Amino acid sequence: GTSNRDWWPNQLDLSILHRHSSLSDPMGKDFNYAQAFEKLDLAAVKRDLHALMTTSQDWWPADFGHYGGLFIRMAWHSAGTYRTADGRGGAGEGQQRFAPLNSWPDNANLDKARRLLWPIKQKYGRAISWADLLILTGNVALESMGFKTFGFAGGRADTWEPEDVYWGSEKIWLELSGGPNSRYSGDRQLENPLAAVQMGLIYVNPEGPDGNPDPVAAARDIRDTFARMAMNDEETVALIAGGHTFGKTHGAGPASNVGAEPEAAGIEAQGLGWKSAYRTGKGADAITSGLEVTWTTTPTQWSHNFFENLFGYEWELTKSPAGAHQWVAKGADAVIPDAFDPSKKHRPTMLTTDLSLRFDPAYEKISRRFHENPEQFADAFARAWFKLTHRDMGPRARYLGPEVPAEVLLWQDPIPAVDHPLIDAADAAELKAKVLASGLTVSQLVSTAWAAASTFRGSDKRGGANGARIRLAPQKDWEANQPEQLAAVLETLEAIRTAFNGAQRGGKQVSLADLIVLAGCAGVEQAAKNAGHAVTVPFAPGRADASQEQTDVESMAVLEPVADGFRNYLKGKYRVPAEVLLVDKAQLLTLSAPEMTVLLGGLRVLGANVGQSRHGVFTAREQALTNDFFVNLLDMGTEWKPTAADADVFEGRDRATGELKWTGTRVDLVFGSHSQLRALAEVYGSADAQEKFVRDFVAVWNKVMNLDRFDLA
Amino acid sequence: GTSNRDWWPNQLDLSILHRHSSLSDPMGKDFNYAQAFEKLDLAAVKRDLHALMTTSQDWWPADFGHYGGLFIRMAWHSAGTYRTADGRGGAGEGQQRFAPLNSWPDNANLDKARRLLWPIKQKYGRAISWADLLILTGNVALESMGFKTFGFAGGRADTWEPEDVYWGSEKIWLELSGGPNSRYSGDRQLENPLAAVQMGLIYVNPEGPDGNPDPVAAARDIRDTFARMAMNDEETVALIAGGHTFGKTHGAGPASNVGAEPEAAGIEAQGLGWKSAYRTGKGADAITSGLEVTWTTTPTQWSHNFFENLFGYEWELTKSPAGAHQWVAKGADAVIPDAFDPSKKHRPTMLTTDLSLRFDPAYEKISRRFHENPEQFADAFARAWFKLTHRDMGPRARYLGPEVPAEVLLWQDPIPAVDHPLIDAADAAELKAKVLASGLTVSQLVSTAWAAASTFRGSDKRGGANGARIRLAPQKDWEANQPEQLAAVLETLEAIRTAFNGAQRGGKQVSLADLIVLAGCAGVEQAAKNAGHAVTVPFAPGRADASQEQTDVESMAVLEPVADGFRNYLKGKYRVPAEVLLVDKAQLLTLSAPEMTVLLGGLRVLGANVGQSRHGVFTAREQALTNDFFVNLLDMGTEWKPTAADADVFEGRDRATGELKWTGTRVDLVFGSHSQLRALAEVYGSADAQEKFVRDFVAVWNKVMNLDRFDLA
């Protein structure tokens, strides 16, 4: 069947905005996962998981009689797709159970892991999501094997279709670098927003870079990829060495014996894949990665034997039974148990990437400290495993259940508790009038609130106006935020806040974070009044102000908008057309196509553009909330042509006279070009649409202001 | 960006069931188009359209100073994509404004037509849809040029994204037959469900079949395609000759002058395409099809000149200025006006396909009758234009406004008015008890009601249980309907109906159509009782019974289910995998993926399979409404393999003993393979899901019973 994508493969794709509709969701409109989870008997779940660890199924026999290592891997791959660039990936939506991740080569035989958990999923039903269950199982694995975890939070609601994520442009699984769709350029520079070295890998190639078995070079790829998943050197060493304290790899015979991944398998395989023709195809004969390494002398028990082995032997390059590069201990005794035959033992073995932890000089210093102080190792691992498995959960208000760690961690972008009465509706009205009487303009107020709120991304639930981090480094200096204009607005609002708070009794006060948002509300109300329409914009107080010391500046860098079509802003020059970057931003903001359309058309006419650019400002009443963007865009009296100076800037002239009327960017003009978007623009540009336009704009503005308000969820 | 479709291009596609979500629709969830239309000043709209006919715009100057031919073409192409096989295409969703149809070669320059209507659309806003506006404009064009139409109904609600229609498998526009993705096989047999001879054509090639200018063979393709659009010979001749009474074709220079279609054009084209480098690119220099034919001596006025020309001259093969095959009148004087220069006249000209109406023997007889009796031609054309433009609108109850023709037409599948009191709740309880006391089983009642209601398709809104057409030819003899079992059920229901109706006074009576549906409801209630549960199935009376004389047997044949996965039925052997056919059926029934999932699982256990097949009957309590299908499908204790006899039948055996537990088809097992479907099946197979499953089943059951109930809308 030939499709639109076939005929016009470079046309913009809006389907990403309308994933996750109520059509594909089996649960009722009113289902609230948090409410279900809060009544789960978590202790009972964990007893069932504990029992499962040593209850072998014959269709995928447990190595050493214990499924712990399989489950740790499973949970670490669930989390391990996370990228800091865009927040996409991670364990927080249970996406491992869908395409493509269910069929990535690095996820081979996790289909068996997940199938082992169906009976518990079945028993507890909607009260425990697959997303939560994956991570809970990894924690119970660890605990059953003698490792004390840092804690666990529930609250990852399940999803019902695949997310549309850019995982790379290669058309071959595992393609080595330097092909026609290489993700690498320059001196081994991995393209943003990717966080893995080859298509279908979680981080790095366990043989070494593009299969070259050099631990030093492999260390470069480990450091770079892990950094792109928000882990520093200490955390990376703790996680790799921690994980590889347990279980084993699987490479008992050649990889040609392994058949189709789950999405390609026959209907009779019932959602499993990688069926192997090698001997029994499972257990002692299993093939997963093609490597055949067992790291420790007690693969089912926490120990400090990984570093004992790493540092206690010299290593020789060797090949698994599938032909993969791996390493074996020179001169060693057979001290490693076999997974199924109590009469066999094996020499210690390592991956290239395990040896990275000894031969990269910065890793070696950490690894040695951990070898000499295993208690430090265990604490670092526990902390890093919690961060790994929670990194995309969002604010601590979303954390559910009885095992949530009390310690507040800097990476959580923490928000202090509120310990005073909040402002009421009359206070809000008072403050809106004070803001408008200060002489701050509609443009300043809208722009500032937009800048504060629109750092939110739904991918990892970071960002948003809560915190008032706009006032701090680094947000206060980001170019998009217009640092000198911002500072003047903030000074004025801070004086309003001080005077209101100084007048109160009873401990009532308003945070700056709330006042930034409220003042933006006032701007939108005043713009509506400038158009002749009285509207009240909703406002919910309860934001708190975070300190600089509670804000990790280097982690906040990935939230900087380098492209924000809603402010007609592009920080530099990109390969991806600006309209594609608009739809990417709308997806991160959780906006539908209608929402994105109304929001953009209103911001244009409110003066929200960076630098006060005229591009897309298709109105002669700037700072009035009207549908003029749409009416003027759609006027066939105007003809549009790209400028000679810049192909991405367009001039709109009167068709009859030649007179210059407007200028616009690709982001403005796409609403008059794309057939779906133009259809939306036509609703808002019709003569009956002024009330609708205003109502819909106010609704979407309030939605954006509240994106991070999980305290009200 | 590589996508799931790239990696697994043959995996089943569920996106078609979550098109048209509330996410992509700009109108609020409570918007009701009918109510907006009913308040439209239709007379005002028509005055504005009359004005527009001769208001020429310089960016696309009007031929003869009158846009009427362009608009007729526009409205005939809007309607013209309709196929009877599936009901898809047609004017009823306004789909000409989206991809791919906005860019089909045969819709070249209708982008200009649509743009000329934006000011009207804008002025009247949501009270007239684009869908309605395209048809109304065609009507006003005809009236403006002196042809009185048969009527007009509003009520086509606009849509907001493209429909996923199979238009063919070719990967080249306009590809001639016999290629790697040929729509033709054998003796010029066009593949179902297609209704056009080439990718991107509305029906036929105007030069002749695969470009061969033979009118006799062109007539074969005209007959076949038009029959696939629900039009017989008289209708066909009336429409082609009526259309071609007006306007002209456009081929002033070589087609290489014509640039990108709208979906390929640059952003500055603002949604238009086919920009031409030939001379001024428009007006006298226009290039659309490449043909240069003007049919009559008065192209802007209704006339009897089409058949006077066709019969009055002999025709000579020639070429247009673009090189296309067309025909010129031998020895004729230059009597045809030029569209732009009062000093030029032209000889009469004809397409190959126009000559088909004279050189095909059966068309010749009609054409001569029309020539000799122009009043017969005008009435046939009026009636056929009404049919053409309303064929996908569904029951007359959906027809809005003051110009709806009073005359009931056979093609509308008419249902008599109800002229008596309806059954009340106490009567419904009394009838349900009578049905359950008669001996009819759960399986029979469910099966019968399913058969009756599931003929509905949302594509053209034909079918459904209203009418009780299940009792008439041809539905009563369809194999999927189990004619012998059906007859026995109907006899019993007819005897209940007679006895109830004979006991009433006041004129109260129950239709058989209602009783079939009510009896189905009683089966579902009894099945819940068999499972130990109280359940209430909603029922809405008010269906009437249609007669055999109101039921066109040949038109009804397209509704026959040759695949119905919901009954595990496949009439024969198809190229398309049966699970694809299930999703296609779910789309015509307007079901989401969760709905399709719950529905099928319940039908399986209630005994709705054709022939009492045990395939997918995964329960030991058949005729009890339980979630057993899901719980047993998902049991990892069972291993599945295709049978040696039949690769599309699977056997499910106990993993430990090898013993046979179940058998299933692809339709059954896809719910345990497809990673999205299996996620849905897990929700209904969970331990906490029995009540959910019953509630969800009853809701979807009632949805299906009411699909055609536009008298309640």
Ligand code: HEM
């Ligand atoms: C440089 C980073 C990493 C590399 C290249 C890597 C590589 C791999 C490979 C190739 C396997 C064998 C797959 C199979 O054949 O069954 C595996 C197994 C495993 N890895 Fe890692 N890994 C890394 C990091 C991690 C981390 C961060 C954790 C968790 C903290 C983890 C925990 C495990 C566990 C527990 C197993 C054993 C699975 C079993 O017993 O079935 N790994 N590793």
Ligand code: HEM
């Ligand atoms: C065998 C079926 C038909 C064929 C092959 C056919 C072919 C075409 C072609 C090739 C054009 C020229 C397009 C261009 O270059 O601008 C056209 C024009 C047109 N057709 Fe048809 N046609 C068919 C049936 C119809 C029907 C059923 C109607 C309406 C009832 C219709 C009404 C028109 C009118 C009004 C125009 C003139 C457009 C203008 O003045 O701009 N045709 N036809």
Ligand SMILES: [Cl-]
């Ligand atoms: Cl994601």
Ligand SMILES: [Cl-]
């Ligand atoms: Cl359609």
Ligand code: NA
């Ligand atoms: Na994420």
Ligand code: NA
């Ligand atoms: Na249709």
